[PDB]
Design a protein around this ligand. Sequence first.
Ligand SMILES: [Cl-]
Ligand SMILES: [Cl-]
Ligand SMILES: [Cl-]
Ligand SMILES: [Cl-]
Lengths: 72, 72
Amino acid sequence: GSARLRALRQRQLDRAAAAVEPDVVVKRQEALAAARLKMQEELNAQVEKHKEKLKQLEEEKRRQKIEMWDSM
Amino acid sequence: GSARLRALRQRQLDRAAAAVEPDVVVKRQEALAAARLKMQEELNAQVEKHKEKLKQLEEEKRRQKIEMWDSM
Ligand SMILES: [Cl-]
Ligand SMILES: [Cl-]
Ligand SMILES: [Cl-]
Ligand SMILES: [Cl-]
C-alpha cells in the first residue's frame, strides 16, 4: 500500500457516505417529490381532457339520433 | 321558342323530378343511413378508448401514491 492509496480510500469512503448524508437525502427527496407533483398535475390534466372528450362524444351520439328523426 | 327548347325543358323537368323519385329517395336514404352507422361505430370505439385511458390514468395516480409511501 501507500499514503496516497490510504488517502484515496478515505476519500472514497467520504463519497460513499455522502450519498446518504442528511443534506443529500433531503435534497434528493425534494427532487423526487417535485417530479411526483409535476407528474400528478399532468395526470390530472389528462383525466380532465379525456372526461371533456367523453362529454363531447356523447353529445355527438345524441345529435346523430336527433338528426335522423328530424330528417324523416 | 322551338321544338329543341321544348324538349330540353321536358328533360330538365324529368331530371328535377328524378331527385325525389322513390328509387332515388330510398337509395339516398340508405347512403345516409350507412354513413350514420359507420360514424356511430367510430364514436362508440372512441368512447371505449377514452374510458380505457381514464382507467389507466387512475391506476397511475394510485401507483404514484403507493410508490411514495413505499419509499419512506
Ligand atoms: Cl461508507
Ligand atoms: Cl383527449
Ligand atoms: Cl319537377
Ligand atoms: Cl384515447
